[PDB]
Design a protein around this ligand. Structure first.
Ligand SMILES: CC(=O)SCCNC(=O)CCNC(=O)[C@H](O)C(C)(C)COP(=O)(O)OP(=O)(O)OC[C@H]1O[C@@H](n2cnc3c(N)ncnc32)[C@H](O)[C@@H]1OP(=O)(O)O
Length: 141
């Protein structure tokens, strides 16, 4: 039902679509392609387009991937609501089962209450804070 499409396999329609989330100019298109090219070359980052029954519902990402940890991010398709939990399920499953990391980490601006609540609901704990960010983690064991 829920499937992950690696950014390394995106087609031009998908690239067009997702980078507009908030007449494509050549410089924007070219900058998106250069990003996708870096993803082909960098095993420490992985971005996925997430599908639910052949409909796009958001993007998830894992960066600073090591054998023990990673950072993650998520972004709901902007016309959809209530898909954060699905994206979070996928993030945790993929990190624990596919990357096999013990620690999942993120940081978010303190004003991002939607994201914080979602992380807290999935048993994340705030372990640090600076002027801009809260830093959260979840450990498998
Ligand atoms: C790459 C990155 O940007 S990573 C940083 C995190 N990602 C982002 O900030 C990207 C922009 N934001 C998003 O894509 C979305 O807002 C997401 C994915 C974070 C959340 O999406 P959704 O789950 O669709 O949002 P939704 O409107 O359902 O709200 C999620 C929950 O927070 C709750 N919430 C909303 N506002 C508040 C608030 N002020 N205080 C506490 N909780 C709140 C909702 O009631 C909801 O509760 P539930 O989980 O009990 O149902």
């Amino acid at each position: 039902l829920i499937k992950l499409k690696n950014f390394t396999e995106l087609n031009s329609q998908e690239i067009e679509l997702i980078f507009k989330w908030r007449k494509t100019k050549y410089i924007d298109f070219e900058e998106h392609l250069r990003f996708l090219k870096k993803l082909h070359q960098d095993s420490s980052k992985k971005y996925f387009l997430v599908f639910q029954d052949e409909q796009i519902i958001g993007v998830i990402d894992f960066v600073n991937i090591t054998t023990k940890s990673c950072e993650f991010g998520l972004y709901a398709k902007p016309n959809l609501k209530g898909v954060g939990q699905i994206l979070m399920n996928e993030i945790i499953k993929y990190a624990f089962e596919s990357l096999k990391v013990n620690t999942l980490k993120a940081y978010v601006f303190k004003s991002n209450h939607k994201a914080l609540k979602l992380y807290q609901q999935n048993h994340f704990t705030i372990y640090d804070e600076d002027k801009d960010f809260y830093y959260v983690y979840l450990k498998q064991s």
